[PDB]
Scaffold this active site. Sequence first.
Site, PDB file in Angstrom:
ATOM      1  N   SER A  42      -0.276   3.771   6.977  1.00  0.00           N
ATOM      2  CA  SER A  42      -0.764   4.031   8.315  1.00  0.00           C
ATOM      3  C   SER A  42       0.153   3.563   9.433  1.00  0.00           C
ATOM      4  O   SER A  42      -0.157   3.803  10.580  1.00  0.00           O
ATOM      5  CB  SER A  42      -2.145   3.429   8.547  1.00  0.00           C
ATOM      6  OG  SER A  42      -3.106   4.014   7.647  1.00  0.00           O
ATOM      7  N   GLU A 140      -3.105  12.449   5.914  1.00  0.00           N
ATOM      8  CA  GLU A 140      -4.017  11.471   5.356  1.00  0.00           C
ATOM      9  C   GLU A 140      -5.027  12.219   4.493  1.00  0.00           C
ATOM     10  O   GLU A 140      -5.516  13.238   4.924  1.00  0.00           O
ATOM     11  CB  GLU A 140      -4.806  10.818   6.496  1.00  0.00           C
ATOM     12  CG  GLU A 140      -4.083   9.706   7.261  1.00  0.00           C
ATOM     13  CD  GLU A 140      -4.292   8.362   6.598  1.00  0.00           C
ATOM     14  OE1 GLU A 140      -4.610   7.359   7.298  1.00  0.00           O
ATOM     15  OE2 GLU A 140      -4.168   8.342   5.353  1.00  0.00           O
TER      16      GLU A 140
HETATM   17  C1  LIG Z   1      -3.485   3.415   6.510  1.00  0.00           C
HETATM   18  O1  LIG Z   1      -2.535   2.795   5.970  1.00  0.00           O
HETATM   19  C2  LIG Z   1      -4.645   3.927   5.816  1.00  0.00           C
HETATM   20  C3  LIG Z   1      -4.790   3.730   4.515  1.00  0.00           C
HETATM   21  N1  LIG Z   1      -5.841   4.134   3.837  1.00  0.00           N
HETATM   22  C4  LIG Z   1      -6.020   3.748   2.416  1.00  0.00           C
HETATM   23  C5  LIG Z   1      -6.339   2.289   2.467  1.00  0.00           C
HETATM   24  O2  LIG Z   1      -5.961   1.624   1.496  1.00  0.00           O
HETATM   25  O3  LIG Z   1      -6.943   1.808   3.485  1.00  0.00           O
HETATM   26  C6  LIG Z   1      -7.138   4.574   1.664  1.00  0.00           C
HETATM   27  C7  LIG Z   1      -7.453   3.943   0.301  1.00  0.00           C
HETATM   28  C8  LIG Z   1      -8.485   4.581   2.378  1.00  0.00           C
HETATM   29  S1  LIG Z   1      -6.490   6.204   1.587  1.00  0.00           S
HETATM   30  O4  LIG Z   1      -7.029   6.686   2.894  1.00  0.00           O
HETATM   31  O5  LIG Z   1      -7.345   7.177   0.506  1.00  0.00           O
END
Ligand SMILES: *C(=O)/C=C/N[C@@H](C(=O)O)C(C)(C)S(=O)O
EC number: 3.5.2.6
Length: 269
Positions: A42, A140
């Site tokens: 992210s 995403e």
């Molecule tokens: C930003 O780095 C968002 C990341 N999202 C992942 C997280 O580990 O928080 C997941 C697992 C939610 S991903 O969106 O499937």
Amino acid sequence: DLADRFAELERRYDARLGVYVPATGTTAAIEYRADERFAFCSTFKAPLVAAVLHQNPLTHLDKLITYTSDDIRSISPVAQQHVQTGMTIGQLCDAAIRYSDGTAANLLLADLGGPGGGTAAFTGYLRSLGDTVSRLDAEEPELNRDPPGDERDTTTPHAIALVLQQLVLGNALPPDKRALLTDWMARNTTGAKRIRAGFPADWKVIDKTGTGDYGRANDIAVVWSPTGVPYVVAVMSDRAGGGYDAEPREALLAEAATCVAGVLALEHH
Ligand SMILES: *C(=O)/C=C/N[C@@H](C(=O)O)C(C)(C)S(=O)O
């Protein structure tokens, strides 16, 4: 020396660690695996919001975007709350930075480049800042899931720190746009256990985190000394050792940041 200390973090957490702090007037660069690729996760959301800010008048922040439950295919704490009524571009930037909302990021990518043109246009924004290294290839949540070694959706600590430097401490953005980005990063809710945890309370910290599969945990920050001296800190990590579901370790990041803060704060008269 500091490389040896960073190496011992890697052994203890069974992780790979990347650190970059740009050189300043009074301090040498801090570099550890600084030109190795790590997944953005992210962290791309920070320069994404800058891309959108840059290309549009501030009045574009008022534009209402409507979306459906079908467009929520990632963890989206704020998007879920606003799904019936929609979110303005401004609200989406806020969500993307401060909650790392995945739907908000995807909607900002569409706003920047259209559907199917967003990841290319985001990467082009980076190219516009002289970053020839970073690339975003998926939205995403797919961009968090490429395997170790895949170059897609990666940056380097060096590259992302130099971008963040331009955005927050350079002139990539006019003052009024620059202030919004800085406010959002300052108000981030997801970074308390990362770079923030490494700096003393009288240092000011703004940041954007990322987390992903293969034990990925990143943070990019700008910090200000008690007398207002600014520094940029990028810390990236993964734990590919434990496969796709490896636990990320925020405390690795806090430790790397503490090592940085020692070098930055500790004077030698
Ligand atoms: C930003 O780095 C968002 C990341 N999202 C992942 C997280 O580990 O928080 C997941 C697992 C939610 S991903 O969106 O499937």
